[PDB]
Amino acid sequence: DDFFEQEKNFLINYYNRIKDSCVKADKMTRSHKNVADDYIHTAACLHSLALEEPTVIKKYLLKVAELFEKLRKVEGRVSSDEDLKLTELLRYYMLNIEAAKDLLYRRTKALIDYENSNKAQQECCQKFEQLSESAKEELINFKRKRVAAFRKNLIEMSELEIKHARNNVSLLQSCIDLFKNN
Amino acid sequence: DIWFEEKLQEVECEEQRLRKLHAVVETLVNHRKELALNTAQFAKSLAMLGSSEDNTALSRALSQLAEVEEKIEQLHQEQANNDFFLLAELLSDYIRLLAIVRAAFDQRMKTWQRWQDAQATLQKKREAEARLLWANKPDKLQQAKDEILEWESRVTQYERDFERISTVVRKEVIRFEKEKSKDFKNHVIKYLETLLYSQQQLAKYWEAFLPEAKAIS
Ligand SMILES: [Pt+2]
Ligand SMILES: [Pt+2]
Ligand SMILES: [Pt+2]
């Protein structure tokens, strides 16, 4: 049964590029909060501009100063939500694959015990024939639970990014057309 | 006068506040561009993943996801640039405008000192005249006196020079305040539609991905 060798030879590449996608995901979320931090670092210098500014222009400007404060929070939502659905989902299957890879080693530990006892016991056979079934089921169950979780985590965010983008549209448009007709 | 000392203190302090705001954008533009790379590079990893995979339904959507981020780094690239060419250069050129009045106010008192530099040598011709008026010689009587009436009009000349430069900078300042009111309302709108187009295109990108996630069976 070459099912166990190929899955192991699949477990080595999927782990290495999931770890790659994991460190690149956190970088994308790290580089995101940086911009999100600047939106509050902008209004700090932007509010200090209307400190000595004409009366009619002061109101024209400060309305967008409040806008940036709101946009600092919304951008804080996506930077944090992506670490809960991408990196964490990617981080979860770094540790369980690390545990799934530990499941085959014990099967060999029952397989060389199968080969050690064959060149002579059934306890090295009843345990392996159980390990070739218990781990055979705990591994396939790990797939369906991973494919479903991959489908679910991709769903929750697509509905979130829709609300987030449609929110900011309902936030910027509340300010553009406010200026088109002052 | 005093209105000239007024429109110099705040402007220094205003250009300072104006210069302190341009610093944030230059780092914000650098941050978003850094994120655009950190997005395409991230997409370049979700594609090799979707390629290195045994499942088909996931490998399909995984590539369909890596393509979406490549559409975002471009939206990110356009965003940062439209933040630089349209907002940062809008600043870096307006502080340049404030540097003109910093030269005019310099030029205004460069003319005032020129007037005083005329009054500095005017008191000499009368002082030299006072010496050639006492001791016995009639030559320098009809020499330095001709120079007295000369500089007497020169200190009058530089004075009227200083008066008119003081006025042209007043019309120069007012020329800004009206052009600022009618344009800044538009100039601040000219920048927001870029964020609007980004958000609409951002939304218009995710709603196209949602069916590609339900298709997983
Ligand atoms: Pt000031
Ligand atoms: Pt690659
Ligand atoms: Pt002065």
Side-chain angles (χ1 to χ4, degrees):
Chain A
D1 196 359
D2 224 1
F3 157 86
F4 320 80
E5 181 135 12
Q6 201 32 264
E7 298 293 313
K8 176 191 227 190
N9 282 0
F10 155 77
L11 277 217
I12 44 79
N13 204 348
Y14 199 71
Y15 175 81
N16 291 19
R17 217 79 276 153
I18 271 290
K19 176 219 282 185
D20 180 76
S21 277
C22 191
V23 304
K24 292 193 186 150
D26 203 21
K27 269 199 59 47
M28 188 185 77
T29 65
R30 270 274 200 296
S31 336
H32 211 130
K33 257 305 285 300
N34 284 161
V35 153
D37 255 7
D38 281 340
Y39 271 47
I40 218 59
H41 270 177
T42 301
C45 308
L46 198 140
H47 126 269
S48 147
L49 220 65
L51 161 80
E52 281 115 336
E53 265 299 285
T55 284
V56 291
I57 261 54
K58 206 169 49 135
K59 341 179 176 40
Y60 276 146
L61 174 95
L62 292 175
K63 203 52 196 197
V64 331
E66 311 179 40
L67 172 155
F68 264 47
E69 218 206 300
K70 321 165 166 283
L71 289 200
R72 179 239 79 85
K73 234 200 166 147
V74 152
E75 292 275 335
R77 297 196 214 150
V78 19
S79 331
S80 137
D81 288 354
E82 287 187 332
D83 197 73
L84 296 171
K85 295 308 126 177
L86 281 296
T87 320
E88 199 60 36
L89 165 83
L90 267 47
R91 260 200 260 279
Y92 174 69
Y93 291 111
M94 299 219 269
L95 331 177
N96 243 1
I97 279 182
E98 188 180 357
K101 241 173 209 188
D102 272 352
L103 259 284
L104 209 152
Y105 214 157
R106 328 175 327 127
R107 200 198 100 103
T108 85
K109 288 253 66 203
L111 210 273
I112 62 113
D113 284 355
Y114 201 79
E115 188 255 12
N116 272 24
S117 102
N118 216 295
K119 302 207 306 141
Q121 210 243 333
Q122 297 302 86
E123 195 221 343
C124 328
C125 185
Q126 196 181 205
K127 203 247 178 69
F128 156 67
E129 100 169 78
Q130 147 262 313
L131 212 23
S132 148
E133 176 96 322
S134 151
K136 180 87 162 289
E137 223 72 8
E138 263 154 322
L139 260 44
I140 298 278
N141 249 336
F142 186 62
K143 183 267 190 145
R144 193 179 40 136
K145 113 160 188 170
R146 181 175 63 78
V147 180
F150 267 59
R151 199 210 84 150
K152 172 170 167 237
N153 282 54
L154 287 175
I155 274 279
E156 180 192 355
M157 211 183 38
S158 295
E159 218 205 17
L160 258 173
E161 295 250 5
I162 273 187
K163 173 56 157 257
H164 278 343
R166 283 217 216 102
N167 189 228
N168 307 10
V169 153
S170 278
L171 268 55
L172 294 147
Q173 214 76 250
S174 310
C175 193
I176 279 196
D177 321 65
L178 139 88
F179 284 5
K180 306 254 298 196
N181 331 84
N182 37 21
Chain B
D1 63 87
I2 183 154
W3 192 88
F4 288 5
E5 312 182 38
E6 287 160 16
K7 298 294 256 197
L8 191 74
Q9 175 265 357
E10 23 69 287
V11 146
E12 287 153 353
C13 286
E14 158 104 350
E15 183 219 53
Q16 274 323 95
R17 289 141 207 150
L18 257 303
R19 273 182 115 99
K20 99 162 174 306
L21 190 93
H22 180 251
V24 156
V25 167
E26 273 189 328
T27 40
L28 187 123
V29 152
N30 137 262
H31 274 158
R32 170 128 56 213
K33 295 188 175 224
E34 190 187 45
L35 179 53
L37 211 75
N38 284 175
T39 294
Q41 187 86 351
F42 179 54
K44 280 154 177 29
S45 115
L46 313 175
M48 258 273 297
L49 195 77
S51 92
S52 291
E53 234 291 335
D54 69 83
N55 188 299
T56 283
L58 287 184
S59 96
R60 176 172 140 95
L62 272 197
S63 96
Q64 298 186 270
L65 174 75
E67 175 98 320
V68 160
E69 264 66 16
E70 287 164 354
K71 310 191 239 149
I72 304 316
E73 59 113 14
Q74 292 175 171
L75 278 197
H76 280 161
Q77 203 62 34
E78 288 201 0
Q79 203 29 263
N81 273 357
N82 286 65
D83 291 347
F84 177 57
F85 303 140
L86 199 85
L87 200 86
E89 271 331 276
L90 187 136
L91 265 40
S92 174
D93 286 353
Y94 273 37
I95 294 88
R96 180 255 326 189
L97 297 189
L98 304 192
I100 320 169
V101 328
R102 285 168 74 81
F105 279 53
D106 227 8
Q107 277 306 136
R108 141 220 72 149
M109 253 186 188
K110 276 200 221 281
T111 43
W112 191 92
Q113 192 68 216
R114 209 129 196 77
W115 175 40
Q116 284 249 290
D117 283 4
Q119 328 175 291
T121 165
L122 185 67
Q123 310 186 195
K124 200 274 309 183
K125 300 276 178 212
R126 312 216 225 271
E127 149 204 309
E129 195 86 25
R131 321 272 265 296
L132 327 150
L133 171 81
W134 293 138
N136 332 99
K137 41 225 180 305
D139 195 352
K140 305 320 254 182
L141 243 186
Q142 256 317 112
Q143 189 259 336
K145 205 184 321 316
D146 346 336
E147 308 173 335
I148 287 203
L149 276 196
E150 187 224 320
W151 274 98
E152 188 143 83
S153 44
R154 255 182 206 284
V155 319
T156 331
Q157 217 255 34
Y158 283 142
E159 175 153 11
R160 311 212 293 288
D161 289 358
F162 157 76
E163 298 154 3
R164 207 60 245 209
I165 175 67
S166 324
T167 51
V168 76
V169 315
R170 280 243 196 161
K171 318 137 80 186
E172 265 282 352
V173 152
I174 271 292
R175 190 49 169 145
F176 187 13
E177 291 172 16
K178 189 41 176 181
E179 294 243 342
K180 136 160 60 163
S181 339
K182 71 218 192 41
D183 281 356
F184 252 11
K185 212 185 60 82
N186 286 344
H187 248 176
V188 85
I189 290 204
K190 257 63 158 290
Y191 176 85
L192 286 211
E193 342 140 283
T194 37
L195 306 199
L196 215 80
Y197 168 81
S198 325
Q199 229 63 25
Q200 279 143 201
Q201 216 71 17
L202 224 52
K204 276 172 86 232
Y205 283 174
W206 288 109
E207 322 215 38
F209 180 94
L210 208 19
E212 330 198 329
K214 281 317 255 201
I216 292 139
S217 34

PDB file of all heavy atoms in Angstrom, chain B residues 158-174:
ATOM      1  N   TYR B 158      14.389 105.590  -3.077  1.00  0.00           N
ATOM      2  CA  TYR B 158      14.301 104.288  -2.428  1.00  0.00           C
ATOM      3  C   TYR B 158      13.096 104.200  -1.501  1.00  0.00           C
ATOM      4  O   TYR B 158      12.543 103.112  -1.305  1.00  0.00           O
ATOM      5  CB  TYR B 158      15.581 103.999  -1.647  1.00  0.00           C
ATOM      6  CG  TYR B 158      16.756 103.583  -2.498  1.00  0.00           C
ATOM      7  CD1 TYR B 158      18.037 104.017  -2.196  1.00  0.00           C
ATOM      8  CD2 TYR B 158      16.586 102.757  -3.599  1.00  0.00           C
ATOM      9  CE1 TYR B 158      19.119 103.644  -2.964  1.00  0.00           C
ATOM     10  CE2 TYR B 158      17.665 102.378  -4.378  1.00  0.00           C
ATOM     11  CZ  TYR B 158      18.929 102.825  -4.053  1.00  0.00           C
ATOM     12  OH  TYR B 158      20.009 102.454  -4.820  1.00  0.00           O
ATOM     13  N   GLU B 159      12.682 105.328  -0.917  1.00  0.00           N
ATOM     14  CA  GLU B 159      11.501 105.322  -0.060  1.00  0.00           C
ATOM     15  C   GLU B 159      10.262 104.929  -0.850  1.00  0.00           C
ATOM     16  O   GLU B 159       9.503 104.044  -0.440  1.00  0.00           O
ATOM     17  CB  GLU B 159      11.314 106.694   0.590  1.00  0.00           C
ATOM     18  CG  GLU B 159      10.044 106.819   1.415  1.00  0.00           C
ATOM     19  CD  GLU B 159      10.169 107.852   2.518  1.00  0.00           C
ATOM     20  OE1 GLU B 159      11.158 108.616   2.510  1.00  0.00           O
ATOM     21  OE2 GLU B 159       9.284 107.895   3.397  1.00  0.00           O
ATOM     22  N   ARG B 160      10.044 105.575  -1.997  1.00  0.00           N
ATOM     23  CA  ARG B 160       8.921 105.211  -2.849  1.00  0.00           C
ATOM     24  C   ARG B 160       9.109 103.843  -3.488  1.00  0.00           C
ATOM     25  O   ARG B 160       8.118 103.201  -3.853  1.00  0.00           O
ATOM     26  CB  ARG B 160       8.711 106.282  -3.919  1.00  0.00           C
ATOM     27  CG  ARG B 160       8.683 107.694  -3.354  1.00  0.00           C
ATOM     28  CD  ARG B 160       7.770 108.605  -4.157  1.00  0.00           C
ATOM     29  NE  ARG B 160       8.276 108.840  -5.506  1.00  0.00           N
ATOM     30  CZ  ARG B 160       9.329 109.600  -5.795  1.00  0.00           C
ATOM     31  NH1 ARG B 160       9.999 110.213  -4.829  1.00  0.00           N
ATOM     32  NH2 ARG B 160       9.709 109.749  -7.055  1.00  0.00           N
ATOM     33  N   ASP B 161      10.355 103.386  -3.633  1.00  0.00           N
ATOM     34  CA  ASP B 161      10.592 101.997  -4.010  1.00  0.00           C
ATOM     35  C   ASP B 161      10.077 101.053  -2.932  1.00  0.00           C
ATOM     36  O   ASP B 161       9.390 100.068  -3.225  1.00  0.00           O
ATOM     37  CB  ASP B 161      12.083 101.763  -4.251  1.00  0.00           C
ATOM     38  CG  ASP B 161      12.582 102.426  -5.514  1.00  0.00           C
ATOM     39  OD1 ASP B 161      11.764 103.038  -6.232  1.00  0.00           O
ATOM     40  OD2 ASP B 161      13.795 102.331  -5.792  1.00  0.00           O
ATOM     41  N   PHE B 162      10.399 101.349  -1.669  1.00  0.00           N
ATOM     42  CA  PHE B 162       9.963 100.502  -0.566  1.00  0.00           C
ATOM     43  C   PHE B 162       8.448 100.527  -0.396  1.00  0.00           C
ATOM     44  O   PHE B 162       7.859  99.530   0.036  1.00  0.00           O
ATOM     45  CB  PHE B 162      10.647 100.935   0.731  1.00  0.00           C
ATOM     46  CG  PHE B 162       9.900 100.536   1.971  1.00  0.00           C
ATOM     47  CD1 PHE B 162       9.920  99.222   2.413  1.00  0.00           C
ATOM     48  CD2 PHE B 162       9.174 101.470   2.691  1.00  0.00           C
ATOM     49  CE1 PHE B 162       9.233  98.848   3.551  1.00  0.00           C
ATOM     50  CE2 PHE B 162       8.484 101.103   3.832  1.00  0.00           C
ATOM     51  CZ  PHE B 162       8.513  99.790   4.261  1.00  0.00           C
ATOM     52  N   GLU B 163       7.805 101.649  -0.721  1.00  0.00           N
ATOM     53  CA  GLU B 163       6.356 101.731  -0.570  1.00  0.00           C
ATOM     54  C   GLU B 163       5.645 100.794  -1.536  1.00  0.00           C
ATOM     55  O   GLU B 163       4.696 100.100  -1.152  1.00  0.00           O
ATOM     56  CB  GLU B 163       5.884 103.169  -0.781  1.00  0.00           C
ATOM     57  CG  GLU B 163       6.431 104.165   0.225  1.00  0.00           C
ATOM     58  CD  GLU B 163       6.494 105.574  -0.332  1.00  0.00           C
ATOM     59  OE1 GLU B 163       6.062 105.776  -1.487  1.00  0.00           O
ATOM     60  OE2 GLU B 163       6.979 106.476   0.383  1.00  0.00           O
ATOM     61  N   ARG B 164       6.092 100.753  -2.792  1.00  0.00           N
ATOM     62  CA  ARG B 164       5.357 100.005  -3.805  1.00  0.00           C
ATOM     63  C   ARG B 164       5.571  98.500  -3.673  1.00  0.00           C
ATOM     64  O   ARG B 164       4.643  97.721  -3.917  1.00  0.00           O
ATOM     65  CB  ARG B 164       5.749 100.488  -5.201  1.00  0.00           C
ATOM     66  CG  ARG B 164       4.662 100.289  -6.249  1.00  0.00           C
ATOM     67  CD  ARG B 164       3.393 101.051  -5.889  1.00  0.00           C
ATOM     68  NE  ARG B 164       2.272 100.155  -5.618  1.00  0.00           N
ATOM     69  CZ  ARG B 164       0.996 100.471  -5.818  1.00  0.00           C
ATOM     70  NH1 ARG B 164       0.673 101.667  -6.293  1.00  0.00           N
ATOM     71  NH2 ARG B 164       0.042  99.593  -5.542  1.00  0.00           N
ATOM     72  N   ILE B 165       6.777  98.067  -3.292  1.00  0.00           N
ATOM     73  CA  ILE B 165       6.999  96.642  -3.057  1.00  0.00           C
ATOM     74  C   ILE B 165       6.153  96.168  -1.884  1.00  0.00           C
ATOM     75  O   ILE B 165       5.622  95.051  -1.892  1.00  0.00           O
ATOM     76  CB  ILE B 165       8.497  96.351  -2.837  1.00  0.00           C
ATOM     77  CG1 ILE B 165       8.718  94.881  -2.468  1.00  0.00           C
ATOM     78  CG2 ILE B 165       9.072  97.244  -1.762  1.00  0.00           C
ATOM     79  CD1 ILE B 165       8.399  93.912  -3.583  1.00  0.00           C
ATOM     80  N   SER B 166       5.994  97.019  -0.869  1.00  0.00           N
ATOM     81  CA  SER B 166       5.124  96.685   0.251  1.00  0.00           C
ATOM     82  C   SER B 166       3.689  96.460  -0.206  1.00  0.00           C
ATOM     83  O   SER B 166       2.949  95.699   0.426  1.00  0.00           O
ATOM     84  CB  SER B 166       5.183  97.792   1.303  1.00  0.00           C
ATOM     85  OG  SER B 166       6.486  98.343   1.397  1.00  0.00           O
ATOM     86  N   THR B 167       3.285  97.098  -1.303  1.00  0.00           N
ATOM     87  CA  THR B 167       1.920  96.969  -1.797  1.00  0.00           C
ATOM     88  C   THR B 167       1.741  95.757  -2.703  1.00  0.00           C
ATOM     89  O   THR B 167       0.705  95.088  -2.634  1.00  0.00           O
ATOM     90  CB  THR B 167       1.509  98.236  -2.550  1.00  0.00           C
ATOM     91  OG1 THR B 167       2.500  98.553  -3.534  1.00  0.00           O
ATOM     92  CG2 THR B 167       1.367  99.404  -1.585  1.00  0.00           C
ATOM     93  N   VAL B 168       2.726  95.459  -3.554  1.00  0.00           N
ATOM     94  CA  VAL B 168       2.560  94.356  -4.495  1.00  0.00           C
ATOM     95  C   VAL B 168       2.515  93.018  -3.764  1.00  0.00           C
ATOM     96  O   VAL B 168       1.865  92.075  -4.231  1.00  0.00           O
ATOM     97  CB  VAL B 168       3.663  94.382  -5.571  1.00  0.00           C
ATOM     98  CG1 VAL B 168       4.985  93.876  -5.016  1.00  0.00           C
ATOM     99  CG2 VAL B 168       3.241  93.560  -6.779  1.00  0.00           C
ATOM    100  N   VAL B 169       3.178  92.909  -2.610  1.00  0.00           N
ATOM    101  CA  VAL B 169       3.076  91.678  -1.831  1.00  0.00           C
ATOM    102  C   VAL B 169       1.737  91.580  -1.116  1.00  0.00           C
ATOM    103  O   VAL B 169       1.294  90.470  -0.799  1.00  0.00           O
ATOM    104  CB  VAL B 169       4.229  91.544  -0.819  1.00  0.00           C
ATOM    105  CG1 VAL B 169       5.555  91.905  -1.467  1.00  0.00           C
ATOM    106  CG2 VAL B 169       3.977  92.402   0.411  1.00  0.00           C
ATOM    107  N   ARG B 170       1.073  92.710  -0.862  1.00  0.00           N
ATOM    108  CA  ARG B 170      -0.278  92.661  -0.316  1.00  0.00           C
ATOM    109  C   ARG B 170      -1.258  92.132  -1.356  1.00  0.00           C
ATOM    110  O   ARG B 170      -2.095  91.273  -1.056  1.00  0.00           O
ATOM    111  CB  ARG B 170      -0.699  94.048   0.173  1.00  0.00           C
ATOM    112  CG  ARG B 170      -0.155  94.416   1.545  1.00  0.00           C
ATOM    113  CD  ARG B 170      -1.275  94.623   2.555  1.00  0.00           C
ATOM    114  NE  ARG B 170      -0.812  95.323   3.750  1.00  0.00           N
ATOM    115  CZ  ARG B 170      -1.612  95.942   4.613  1.00  0.00           C
ATOM    116  NH1 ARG B 170      -2.924  95.950   4.418  1.00  0.00           N
ATOM    117  NH2 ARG B 170      -1.099  96.553   5.671  1.00  0.00           N
ATOM    118  N   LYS B 171      -1.161  92.631  -2.591  1.00  0.00           N
ATOM    119  CA  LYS B 171      -1.965  92.072  -3.670  1.00  0.00           C
ATOM    120  C   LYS B 171      -1.544  90.645  -3.993  1.00  0.00           C
ATOM    121  O   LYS B 171      -2.364  89.848  -4.461  1.00  0.00           O
ATOM    122  CB  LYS B 171      -1.865  92.950  -4.920  1.00  0.00           C
ATOM    123  CG  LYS B 171      -1.932  94.448  -4.651  1.00  0.00           C
ATOM    124  CD  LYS B 171      -0.892  95.206  -5.467  1.00  0.00           C
ATOM    125  CE  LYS B 171      -1.355  95.422  -6.899  1.00  0.00           C
ATOM    126  NZ  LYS B 171      -0.291  96.045  -7.734  1.00  0.00           N
ATOM    127  N   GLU B 172      -0.276  90.306  -3.748  1.00  0.00           N
ATOM    128  CA  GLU B 172       0.188  88.947  -4.004  1.00  0.00           C
ATOM    129  C   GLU B 172      -0.394  87.966  -2.996  1.00  0.00           C
ATOM    130  O   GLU B 172      -0.722  86.826  -3.347  1.00  0.00           O
ATOM    131  CB  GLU B 172       1.715  88.899  -3.976  1.00  0.00           C
ATOM    132  CG  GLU B 172       2.370  89.025  -5.340  1.00  0.00           C
ATOM    133  CD  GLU B 172       2.319  87.734  -6.131  1.00  0.00           C
ATOM    134  OE1 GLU B 172       1.917  86.701  -5.557  1.00  0.00           O
ATOM    135  OE2 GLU B 172       2.681  87.753  -7.326  1.00  0.00           O
ATOM    136  N   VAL B 173      -0.528  88.390  -1.739  1.00  0.00           N
ATOM    137  CA  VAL B 173      -1.072  87.509  -0.710  1.00  0.00           C
ATOM    138  C   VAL B 173      -2.564  87.290  -0.933  1.00  0.00           C
ATOM    139  O   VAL B 173      -3.060  86.160  -0.861  1.00  0.00           O
ATOM    140  CB  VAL B 173      -0.783  88.083   0.690  1.00  0.00           C
ATOM    141  CG1 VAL B 173      -1.843  87.636   1.687  1.00  0.00           C
ATOM    142  CG2 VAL B 173       0.607  87.671   1.155  1.00  0.00           C
ATOM    143  N   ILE B 174      -3.299  88.369  -1.217  1.00  0.00           N
ATOM    144  CA  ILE B 174      -4.735  88.257  -1.456  1.00  0.00           C
ATOM    145  C   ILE B 174      -5.013  87.406  -2.689  1.00  0.00           C
ATOM    146  O   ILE B 174      -6.018  86.686  -2.746  1.00  0.00           O
ATOM    147  CB  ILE B 174      -5.358  89.665  -1.567  1.00  0.00           C
ATOM    148  CG1 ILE B 174      -5.798  90.163  -0.187  1.00  0.00           C
ATOM    149  CG2 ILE B 174      -6.529  89.687  -2.542  1.00  0.00           C
ATOM    150  CD1 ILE B 174      -6.965  89.395   0.400  1.00  0.00           C
TER     151      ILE B 174
END
